[PDB]
Amino acid sequence: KEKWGIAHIYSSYNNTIIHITDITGAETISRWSGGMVVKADRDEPSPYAAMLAARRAAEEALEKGIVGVHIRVRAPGGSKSKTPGPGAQAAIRALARAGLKIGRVEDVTPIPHDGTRPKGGRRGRRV
RNA sequence: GCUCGCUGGGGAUACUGCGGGCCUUGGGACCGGGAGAGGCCGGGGGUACCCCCGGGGUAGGGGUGAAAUCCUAUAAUCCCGGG
Ligand SMILES: [Mg+2]
Ligand SMILES: [Mg+2]
Ligand SMILES: [Mg+2]
Numbered sequence: 699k700e701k702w703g704i705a706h707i708y709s710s711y712n713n714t715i716i717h718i719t720d721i722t723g724a725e726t727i728s729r730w731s732g733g734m735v736v737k738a739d740r741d742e743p744s745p746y747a748a749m750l751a752a753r754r755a756a757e758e759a760l761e762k763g764i765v766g767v768h769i770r771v772r773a774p775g776g777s778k779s780k781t782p783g784p785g786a787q788a789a790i791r792a793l794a795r796a797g798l799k800i801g802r803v804e805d806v807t808p809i810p811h812d813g814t815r816p817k818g819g820r821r822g823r824r825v
Numbered sequence: 826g827c828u829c830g831c832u833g834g835g836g837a838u839a840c841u842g843c844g845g846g847c848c849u850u851g852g853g854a855c856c857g858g859g860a861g862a863g864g865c866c867g868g869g870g871g872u873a874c875c876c877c878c879g880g881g882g883u884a885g886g887g888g889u890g891a892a893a894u895c896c897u898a899u900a901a902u903c904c905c906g907g908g
């Protein structure tokens with residue numbers, strides 16, 4: 699019939715991770731991060747690295763019989779920043795261009811209802 | 826005039842003081858329908874985060890203006906089921 703999977707995208711200011719699993723999430727199909735396609739630590743969160751990683755993951759998934767994916771994109775969340783980095787949209791676009799169909803798209807960033815205390819003291823980073 | 830201070834008598838009753846009588850406006854008591862993260866005690870929850878166990882996967886993760894220390898083949902980061 700139709701084999702559909704899930705693409706988990708983890709986007710921060712330092713890196714990007716693209717992880718394709720099956721429909722239930724318990725079996726991993728492919729997994730690629732920004733540090734596996736570039737040489738400079740400064741280029742890990744760039745959109746171009748996201749495109750490269752997404753292309754590699756999409757090819758590996760396509761060779762195994764996956765047809766389309768639903769997308770779940772997240773920032774670090776918690777007591778860290780709630781906003782996704784610059785590589786999320788580039789990752790989303792590259793998956794479609796590689797040949798996979800796209801289902802529904804939603805963000806699953808974990809948000810606290812007044813949880814724990816963040817780092818930096820009561821004055822924050824002083825730079 | 827000064828020693829602005831003392832003392833024997835007579836007169837007045839507006840104000841202050843003292844005694845008596847009569848009030849309700851200030852203050853207090855009580856009744857009615859409502860408002861509020863005011864306080865104390867008991868019970869039930871919400872996501873988030875950390876650690877441990879089991880399944881998948883394999884070479885990086887993290888962090889900076891740029892790096893390094895640090896974590897990772899005793900299988901990390903990431904995903905799933907539980908405590
Ligand atoms: Mg890296
Ligand atoms: Mg410190
Ligand atoms: Mg300075």
Ligand SMILES: [Mg+2]
Nearest residue numbers: 879880881900
């Ligand atoms: Mg395991």
